[PDB]
Amino acid sequence: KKGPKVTVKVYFDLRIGDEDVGRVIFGLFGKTVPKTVDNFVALATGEKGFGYKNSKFHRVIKDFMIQGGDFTRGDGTGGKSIYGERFPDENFKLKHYGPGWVSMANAGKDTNGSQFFITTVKTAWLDGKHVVFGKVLEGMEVVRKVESTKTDSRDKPLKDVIIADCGKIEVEKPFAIAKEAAAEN
């Protein structure tokens, strides 16, 4: 089986208000989609002042996905990249094969910002519109825990979900992965 090669890994630590529910490890495809992995890694490491630290998930719609990455405004209208404000779509070489595939959220065409979502079920109606650049490697149980928190009519979680930390883990040898669902022990 042929699969994409992962080049960098990033980690998040999540907190639901007061409990620390765990750590999530993403592995990003840097040789397939560069300039989109770079934006994510730069914003995670916080090397330019602004970053994902102390940000929040604002859409936890059940059985669909969890979205976050708006560090400027509380709602889902803010966010900026390192290449200005918005940058164009690169290539749709990968699809949404199942749970745990990370992708870029956009409000039209060529409007990628800094907001991402993690799909929890297979979404084949989104292919060709959103650009996919990663896959969840560890901590699928934490994603499942966050997906089941109580929401409201606008999908804003009643208790806040906070990225209490974010960083970067280096990979010495690129390796391929399977183009299917992930983990789910």
């Binding site: 560069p34 290449y83 200005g84 918005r86 940058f87 690169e90 060529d110």
Partner: peptide, 12 residues
């Protein structure tokens, strides 16, 4: 070389 370098948005 890298074909990502020659692409930039229309606002820029």
């Amino acid at each position: 070389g890298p074909p990502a370098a020659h692409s930039l948005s229309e606002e820029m």
